[PDB]
Amino acid sequence: GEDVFEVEKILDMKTEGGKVLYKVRWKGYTSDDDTWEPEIHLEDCKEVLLEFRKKIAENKA
């Protein structure tokens, strides 16, 4: 009941009136299934966050 779905990775982020959302790729699903999630859903996904921060840093320089 606890692991029905898994985040593969954060694809991108946004704010909407200052509040953070993440666009999520669900492991085992296609890009048609991607969703926007509020930050509080991902805030504790440490590895997922590290990987997204790395992708930000890499696209910076």
Residue numbers in the entry: 0 to 60
Extract from the study:
M-phase phosphoprotein 8 (MPP8) was initially identified to be a component of the RanBPM-containing large protein complex, and has recently been shown to bind to methylated H3K9 both in vivo and in vitro. MPP8 binding to methylated H3K9 is suggested to recruit the H3K9 methyltransferases GLP and ESET, and DNA methyltransferase 3A to the promoter of the E-cadherin gene, mediating the E-cadherin gene silencing and promote tumor cell motility and invasion. MPP8 contains a chromodomain in its N-terminus, which is used to bind the methylated H3K9. Here, we reported the crystal structures of human MPP8 (hMPP8) chromodomain both in free form and in complex with the trimethylated histone H3 lysine 9 (H3K9me3) peptide (residue 1–15).
To unveil the molecular architecture of the chromodomain of hMPP8, hMPP8 chromodomain (55–116 residues) was recombinantly expressed and crystallized. In the free form, the hMPP8 chromodomain consists of a twisted anti-parallel β-sheet formed by three β-strands (named β2–β4), and α helix (named αA) located at the C-terminal end packing against one edge of the β-sheet next to β2. In the asymmetric unit of the crystal, two hMPP8 chromodomain monomers form a dimer through the interaction between the β2 strand from each monomer. The β2 strand from one subunit runs anti-parallel to the β2' strand from the neighboring one, pulling the three-stranded anti-parallel β-sheets of two hMPP8 chromodomain proteins adjacent to constitute a six-stranded anti-parallel β-sheet. Specifically, Asp66, Met67, Thr69, Gly71 and Gly72 of β2 strand form hydrogen bond with Gly72', Gly71', Thr69', Met67' and Asp66' of β2' strand from the opposite subunit, respectively. The dimer interface has a buried surface area of about 1025 Å2, which is strong enough to form a stable dimer. Sequence alignment result indicates that hMPP8 chromodomain is more similar to HP1 choromodomain and lacks the residues in dPlycomb chromodomain for dimerization. It was quite unexpectedly to find that hMPP8 chromodomain forms homodimer in our crystal structures. To determine the oligomerization state of hMPP8 chromodomain in solution, size exclusion experiment was performed. The size of hMPP8 chromodomain in solution is corresponding to dimer, consistent with the observation in crystal structure. Therefore, the chromodomain exists as a homodimer in solution and the homodimer structure in crystal is not due to crystal packing.
